[PDB]
């Protein structure tokens, strides 16, 4: 699991993946706000104070996900979490957003064993991510930035910036 958090069907992994399957299902079935938050704190690497993740929520590992304080994640979010996904404070994430830590080689022979490479995703403080957005590997979204609904983010986004479209392009500066 350490060749993987560093971006290369293991024993540890298949247990951790199977634990997450258990907890996800339990969370997505929980009708109780407190019990979900509780279960989620057992799924996630870290889930901050006054923070909230709406079900159904999907990921593979859980423990690679760290979520800060007063951040809200809306329903139906998918996170391919083979590499760390770090989300700061006061972050808003709209529904059906996708985080793809994983990806593969172009060459089909380099794919027959399902070799995944993973690069972490970082969402800094006070960021608003629109519904239906995709964020691919290695992306950092800088503090106080906005990603418009349905964008696909392939490159790092500077702080105090608005971005939209697909690929995402910088629409305007939110600097004072």
């Amino acid at each position: 699991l350490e060749k993987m958090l560093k971006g290369h069907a293991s024993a540890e992994i298949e247990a951790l993946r199977s634990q997450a399957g258990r907890l996800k299902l339990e969370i997505n079935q929980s009708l109780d706000e407190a019990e979900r938050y509780a279960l989620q704190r057992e799924l996630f690497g870290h889930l901050g104070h006054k923070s909230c993740v709406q079900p159904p929520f999907h990921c593979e590992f859980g423990k690679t996900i760290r979520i800060g304080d007063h951040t809200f994640i809306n329903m139906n979010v998918v996170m391919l979490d083979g590499a760390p996904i770090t989300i700061g404070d006061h972050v808003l994430i709209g529904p059906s957003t996708q985080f793809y830590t994983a990806s593969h080689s172009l060459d089909y022979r380099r794919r027959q064993a399902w070799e995944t490479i993973c690069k972490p995703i970082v969402i800094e403080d006070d960021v608003w991510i629109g519904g239906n957005v995709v964020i691919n590997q290695g992306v950092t979204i800088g503090a106080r930035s906005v990603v418009a609904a349905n964008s696909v983010v392939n490159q790092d986004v500077p702080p105090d910036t608005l971005v939209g479209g697909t690929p995402a392009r910088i629409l305007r500066s939110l600097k004072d």
Copy 2:
């Protein structure tokens, strides 16, 4: 809940949101067409005759959603329903479509309390909405119009019109 249906963690609201969590889960788990339709009529503001909503279906409040007659909504649809969402008769909605009544201010200080503003969405009669479409706040789609799969609709769409792309642009007139 009235400062909100008018587009500004309340008592009523947290009950209505918690009721919807209950019913959604029950609907999405129901293997019985009649019992789903029954449960859905208890979730929704209104669900018309010969109308059909395929599970899993996701929303927050339920009671702000009014669906007309002979309309079909395919599976995995998400509706952020803080403001009314009104859907007419003979409407077809493809799977994984998103309705976002909610949104936020650009300014990150105007977002720390998760203040949402909500504007209603209206889908008139005989409209066909493609799979994977996003419809943002305040949008009306006029009667007999078509929205192509994967479009993102930000502005009102006239009747008898075909629209596609992202942002949606008017592709051709379906007027006789």
Copy 3:
């Protein structure tokens, strides 16, 4: 059901659709890798050896879906399977991908009875499909091709080819 696999509320159909509702729910609730694979082999037309479909997975009929060997389908995939969907060997499909076998007529009068037309989708061997992709009717993706995350594929994609954007356009040749 034969006017339909050939691309036009029946008895057979409503049973087969209702069986799939049963099995889907059972699969998406299964915490056991072996039991899912088992249940999935009962849902699908064919599910090959060393092949893997991650829950939750959504479709309508199940029996029209044939999946080859060593292919991996990630979570939250939706398949409108009124016409055959044929997926080869060593295929990778990213999460939240959509296959739309179904579609409708532009004309709203040609839609009041929810008449669907269906055209099959074929994904050949060694193809990698990115997360969040839409594939519409009648599309074949040729062997060893790559479809970048979030593309919408409307036309056939030649083998040894990389495609991306929406509509998908051919980005580069993966021929040796």
